[PDB]
Design a protein around this ligand. Structure first.
Ligand SMILES: [Mg+2]
Ligand SMILES: [Mg+2]
Lengths: 294, 227, 293, 226
């Protein structure tokens, strides 16, 4: 609507890919692990800080309407706070696999060298994942409604859980009331990022990113009430900007946790480089980027 | 519009410049030298001073790295290859990689210096971008982020009008300008990782103001704003 | 404390039996299974009726302080009402075992022929189970706080009392009985001469009368008076309704078992599911001796 | 004491009963015969009748079989083996077992008849126990249970005073009399189980009032209107 043919082509494409690679009902998230029915001490305190603010109740509904509801333990002194980590790992892996499929379906990403595909996916995995989660995030009740599953945030007395940049990011992104096109456009911008460490076709990625950014700007310009939504692009850009911080700090945090308590799936180990050449360093990722064998 | 006058930001930019001996030391001294200048530049931006003092402190502590980075990245346009410090010092590739900061160096060149160069970014645009970076409502401890936000989007509006007026042949120049913010952020974080690592060792003669910025009263910054 | 020596001897023996054989924390209720993560239909309606009443949520802890909380499904979804049945069965079996042990420790019960022990246990198993379930029952939250586990009554309120069992639990909890009174009720209903296969009718009769008199005396001695004069009466009303409840349950559980087998072998023996006495109750008979390990 | 006179209940019991074939039919027309009789008796209890008529019919519909069973169990005291009826019929073991009601027959014998025999229960205490059974406040559908509990308690107190006074030699007799309620309850249940079973089959007398008792009104309802 009101865009050039190439822009609307990009939007239609992104929408198609999102549609084909994002199971919002999570009906195919199966066989996931469930929570069972000196410097060491300082870093341990660190990891504890990391987990204390990110506690969620795990609601699970059944075929017949039966609902099993998990609540995490209050912090003590050991493993009792590392109870959801396997499940979180499985969820993360499912989402990541979805993101990789998403990147594959897009033509531009598919025309890039495999090494650049690896680099871009490495740099944008967690970001895209977070965006998609914001798509099913319920700001009203503070819950991620993943079809059968639901991740509700645990109370403390709200204003003090916004001192975690991730939750604040989800609330502030959900307040923006974005269309699907805008979400998938953000995904496109963060995905095609030239600043990512091991990219070779920096030129093409840059051109593409600028094109997507302009497409987004123009979409806000044409498909929303004129002065009600003029600073929307600014807010979205701020979001894409904080997304970086979130990504870095999530990486280092996950590192700190894995360091004293291994839990992360091989795919996660690859996406965050946990132990070269790009293809041997990411055999799983690299394998997922080639088709098929169905 | 004219409430956040773009020309005032431009002269705010113009008032603060007209221009391996342990290259790490050199960068630290350059930064320290440019932190006071950063305070003055900040005070020269409209409405920044009529904010709560502690909010000013917060914004500066949150943005100083990105601001300085944008500054010297835009300074390095004139030179062909390398990065020109504010101390008239020209840091090159070889020593940067020899200093263990080669990757972030190259990333700064490609994402910022190169892009700013090709895009022919002027200084009022740079000043507007840096102003936007400065007015970050999502900073921690803000007594009120609403005003900060209003200011940010005033700079936004002024900049968009500026790009409409000045570059009618480039319909998507504004979005392209804003598109630098995420890249700048990653570069900023990645520079902080370094500064902390270099400080952790104590190998480099860091200076007072930089140390104050790297630590989390504080003294200095709270002073330079009373004037 | 106005009793004879033999009376307080009874009370002491009973209190000891209870203390030894009743685990109020349920720490040893383990390995239990949990809910999954023409005329036939005429029966289906009836069994349905039977089930939509006793809908309880299964709250389960802990020891990291975690809480797994299960909520039963809405009715149909047919067959999704039989989700708690296996767990409920295991629970009933554990309780029944505790009760059996409680019967064994008691000297008088031990002096009876094994046949009379079997008959008495059969007749009073469920009643004793309800009496032992009432002590851990919370009248305010409508919850059976079985230590780690909790079973909470799901809402629809006055229509909860229209089910004789819930009404029984609230009514009995309202009397605020002491432990002695509880174990004495257990004693009275356990030593019932009117049980179907009782050979030593006279001895059982005597024991029961002594227990009832002992309970009466306890009521008139360790309670204020005349504040708790009709207390023995309300207790006898409870022992009276407990019969109706026993039978009603029995028939109901039969009607559930007929179309949906779930009862444990012990429950099958206790309630006559699928001639001689010991042959018919191998497990019970075996539990009434000592001892293989 | 005086609000629930034990002698009032005693005379309530005395003004009601001073003194091929098929046994099932017999027991039926006997219960049927004793139902109106039962209504008269019930109407002879203090405070039974200023009660809401609804609550009355509920109480009667709840306790009728226990009342009748207690009554003929007490009656068959005089006779040796077997059970004596209000129709002057003397039903025996063999006949009861042939009728398929042998078990419940033996139960009523050894649990009630024999207990009333050895304990030497009198008709005053019988009347009081039946008054206890009648005043069952835990009967659903009542408009005001409160009165019912209160009455039950009154009868209880009166009976306990009666037993303490009249039988000083046996201190635990009252509790023994109350101990007959759970036994009588399970028996009343097992009897109904036969009646419903016999209603199903149709080879036995319909009986009409008994029929009305075997359902979920108007006969009873009008009988209470005088
Ligand atoms: Mg070197
Ligand atoms: Mg025969």
């Amino acid at each position: 609507q009101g865009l050039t043919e190439e822009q609307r082509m990009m939007i239609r494409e992104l929408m198609d890919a999102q549609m084909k690679t994002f199971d919002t009902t999570f009906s195919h998230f199966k066989n996931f692990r469930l929570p069972g029915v000196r410097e060491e001490a300082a870093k341990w305190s660190q990891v504890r800080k990391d987990l204390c603010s990110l506690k969620v109740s795990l609601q699970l509904r059944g075929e017949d309407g039966s609902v099993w509801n998990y609540k995490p333990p209050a912090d003590s002194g050991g493993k009792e706070i590392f109870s959801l980590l396997p499940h979180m790992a499985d969820m993360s892996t499912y989402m990541f696999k979805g993101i990789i499929s998403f990147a594959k379906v897009i033509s531009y990403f598919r025309d890039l060298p495999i090494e650049d595909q690896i680099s871009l996916l490495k740099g944008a995995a967690f970001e895209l994942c977070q965006l998609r989660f914001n798509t099913v995030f319920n700001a009203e009740t503070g819950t991620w409604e993943c079809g059968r599953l639901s991740y509700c945030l645990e109370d403390t007395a709200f204003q003090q859980l916004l001192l975690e940049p991730m939750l604040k990011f989800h609330y502030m992104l959900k307040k923006l009331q974005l269309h699907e096109e805008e979400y998938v456009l953000m995904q496109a911008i963060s995905l095609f990022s030239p600043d990512r460490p091991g990219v070779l076709q920096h030129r093409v990625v840059d051109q593409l990113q600028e094109q997507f950014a302009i497409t987004l700007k123009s979409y806000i310009e044409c498909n929303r009430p004129q002065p009600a939504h003029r600073f929307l692009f600014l807010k979205i850009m701020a979001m894409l900007t904080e997304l970086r911080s979130i990504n870095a700090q999530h990486t280092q945090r996950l590192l700190r946790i894995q360091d004293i308590h291994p839990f992360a799936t091989p795919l996660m180990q690859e996406l965050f480089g946990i132990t070269s050449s790009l293809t041997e360093r990411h055999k799983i990722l690299h394998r997922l980027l080639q088709e098929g064998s169905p | 519009n004219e409430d956040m006058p773009v020309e005032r930001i431009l002269e705010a930019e113009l008032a603060v410049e007209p221009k391996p001996n342990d290259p790490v030391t050199n960068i630290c001294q350059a930064a320290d030298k440019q932190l006071f200048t950063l305070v003055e530049w900040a005070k020269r931006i409209p409405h920044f001073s009529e904010l709560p003092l502690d909010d000013q402190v917060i914004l500066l502590r949150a943005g100083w790295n990105e601001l300085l980075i944008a500054s010297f990245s835009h300074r390095s346009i004139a030179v062909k290859d390398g990065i020109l410090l504010a101390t008239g010092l020209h840091v090159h590739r070889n020593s940067a990689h020899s200093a263990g900061v080669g990757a972030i160096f190259d990333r700064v060149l490609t994402e910022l210096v190169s892009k700013m160069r090709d895009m022919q970014m002027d200084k009022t645009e740079l000043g507007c971008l840096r102003a936007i970076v400065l007015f970050n409502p999502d900073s921690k401890g803000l007594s009120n982020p609403a005003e900060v936000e209003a200011l940010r989007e005033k700079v936004y509006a002024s900049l968009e009008a500026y790009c409409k007026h000045k570059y009618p042949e480039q319909p998507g120049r504004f979005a392209k300008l804003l598109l630098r913010l995420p890249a700048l952020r990653s570069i900023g974080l990645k520079c902080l990782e370094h500064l902390f690592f270099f400080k952790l060792i104590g190998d480099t003669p860091i200076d007072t103001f930089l140390m104050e910025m790297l630590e989390a009263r504080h003294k200095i910054l709270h002073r330079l704003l009373q004037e």
